[PDB]
């Protein structure tokens, strides 16, 4: 009907229950790989010349706080990296 | 911002809900789809980058008011082509494409105080000659307009209001 | 087991689509039955959304939209050493001269 909340309450409700949930803060994902540049999504706490830990012993560089993603640079070999990591 | 994006689907939309005389449902059914796209989470993994059918898939497990074919189908071709945030959007344009098609329009009167109502009736028998359209009030109230009143419908404005007498005589002066 | 599927074909740069927790990593090799010869396709890019960027290794005039691919866990790999010695061989190190087969012990 109307659902004014219930609607609202109602898709709270099944959001949480098909677990959907958000990333946390300094947390993000690769979403994608070329030629030695990185765009993250996540990271909703990086902030611009930040450090970004990758898997391996390695850095990014964050230059880039776009709306919905971060765009950072790989400092060593990028060939290893994959989305979703 | 979503205009000239959302404008094909809303006609599709509209087009298909003509031919099966269930307009009434639709408007509705994308009402919903509009306000879980307004969520928290879901707003994120709508920004997020997944491969067009997870997101479709994703999506459609929180809808059960839409129905099982015609709503998925719309939202799965929204997927695949990444547009879901347009969904506010699409619901906009398909209600005023209904409004055309019903030949049903809205008009605003802006006014200094309430009206006497047989004023409202002269106001809205007049705008149904000004437009063709069966023309619903919603009266509102502003002391700007000191006396008068103000008649929008639309994009096309009458400015009785003493107000705009005042300024349109000062900048002769 | 192939797992991709063509997605576009743009002169020699092909793209393709796998799931999205498989992606190949970046100078992977992949392969596809172009007719009934296969071709090798080396990666260039990580697009967005688990759709991969790459370059054909061959002529890519036949290839359809939604061919199967086979991704190769490993960079393009040649035969090296010794017995490559008065050979002539292409990139992806298949024997040239007429010879037959390379006795290649190690890639």
Same mark, same amino acid.
């Given at each position: *009907?109307?659902?004014?909340?219930? /609607?609202?309450?109602?898709?709270? *409700?099944?959001?949480? *229950?098909?677990?959907?949930?958000?990333?946390?803060?300094?947390?993000?994902?690769?979403?994608?790989?070329?030629?030695?540049?990185?765009?993250?999504?996540?990271?909703?706490?990086?902030? *611009?010349?930040?450090? /970004?830990?990758?898997?391996? &012993?390695?850095?990014?560089?964050?230059? &880039?706080?776009?709306?919905?993603?971060?765009?950072?640079?790989?400092?060593?070999?990028?060939?290893?990296?994959?989305?979703?990591? | 911002?979503?205009?000239?994006?959302?404008?094909?689907?809303? @006609?599709?939309?509209?087009?298909?809900?003509?031919?099966?005389?269930? #307009?009434?449902?639709?408007?509705?059914?994308?009402?919903?789809?509009?306000?879980?796209? @307004?969520?928290?989470?879901?707003?994120?993994?709508?920004?997020?980058?997944?491969?067009?059918?997870?997101?479709?898939?994703?999506?459609?497990?929180?809808?059960?008011?839409?129905?099982?074919?015609?709503?998925?189908?719309?939202?799965? #071709?929204?997927?695949?082509?990444?547009?879901?945030?347009?969904?506010?959007?699409?619901?906009?344009?398909?209600?005023?494409?209904?409004?055309?098609?019903?030949?049903?329009?809205?008009?605003?009167?802006?006014?200094?105080?309430?009206?006497?109502?047989?004023?409202?009736?002269?106001?809205?028998?007049?705008?149904?000659?000004?437009?063709?359209?069966?023309?619903?009030?919603?009266? @509102?109230?502003?002391?700007? #307009?000191?006396?008068? #009143?103000?008649?929008?419908?639309?994009?096309?404005?009458?400015?009785?209001?003493?107000?705009?007498?005042?300024?349109?005589?000062?900048?002769?002066? | 087991?192939?797992?991709?599927?063509?997605?576009?074909?743009?002169?020699?740069?092909?793209?393709?689509?796998?799931?999205?927790?498989?992606?190949?990593?970046?100078?992977?090799?992949?392969?596809?039955?172009? =007719?009934?010869? +296969?071709?090798?396709?080396?990666?260039?890019?990580?697009?967005?959304? =688990?759709?991969? +960027?790459?370059?054909?290794? %061959?002529?890519?005039? %036949?290839?359809?939209?939604?061919?199967?691919?086979?991704?190769?866990?490993?960079?393009?790999?040649?035969?090296?050493?010794?017995?490559?010695?008065? +050979?002539?061989?292409?990139?992806? %190190?298949?024997?040239?001269?007429?010879? =037959?087969?390379?006795?290649?012990?190690?890639?």
């Amino acid at each position: *009907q109307l659902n004014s909340t219930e /609607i609202s309450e109602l898709i709270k *409700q099944r959001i949480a *229950q098909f677990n959907v949930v958000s990333e946390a803060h300094n947390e993000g994902t690769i979403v994608s790989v070329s030629d030695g540049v990185i765009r993250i999504h996540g990271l909703a706490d990086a902030m *611009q010349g930040e450090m /970004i830990s990758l898997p391996g &012993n390695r850095y990014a560089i964050a230059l &880039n706080l776009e709306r919905d993603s971060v765009g950072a640079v790989v400092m060593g070999p990028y060939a290893d990296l994959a989305e979703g990591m | 911002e979503f205009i000239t994006v959302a404008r094909p689907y809303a @006609k599709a939309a509209f087009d298909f809900a003509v031919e099966h005389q269930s #307009v009434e449902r639709w408007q509705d059914m994308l009402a919903f789809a509009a306000e879980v796209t @307004k969520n928290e989470q879901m707003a994120e993994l709508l920004s997020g980058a997944l491969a067009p059918e997870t997101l479709a898939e994703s999506f459609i497990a929180v809808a059960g008011e839409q129905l099982d074919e015609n709503g998925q189908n719309l939202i799965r #071709v929204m997927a695949e082509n990444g547009r879901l945030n347009a969904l506010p959007d699409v619901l906009e344009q398909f209600i005023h494409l209904r409004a055309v098609s019903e030949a049903t329009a809205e008009v605003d009167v802006i006014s200094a105080a309430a009206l006497s109502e047989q004023q409202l009736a002269k106001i809205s028998a007049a705008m149904e000659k000004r437009l063709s359209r069966k023309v619903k009030l919603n009266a @509102k109230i502003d002391k700007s #307009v000191m006396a008068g #009143v103000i008649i929008r419908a639309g994009d096309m404005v009458i400015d009785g209001s003493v107000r705009g007498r005042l300024e349109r005589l000062a900048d002769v002066l | 087991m192939a797992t991709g599927k063509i997605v576009q074909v743009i002169g020699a740069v092909v793209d393709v689509e796998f799931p999205q927790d498989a992606v190949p990593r970046v100078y992977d090799a992949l392969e596809v039955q172009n =007719g009934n010869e +296969r071709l090798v396709l080396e990666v260039q890019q990580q697009l967005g959304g =688990g759709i991969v +960027r790459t370059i054909a290794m %061959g002529s890519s005039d %036949g290839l359809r939209r939604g061919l199967d691919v086979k991704d190769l866990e490993h960079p393009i790999e040649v035969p090296v050493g010794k017995a490559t010695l008065g +050979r002539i061989m292409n990139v992806l %190190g298949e024997p040239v001269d007429m010879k =037959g087969e390379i006795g290649e012990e190690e890639r």
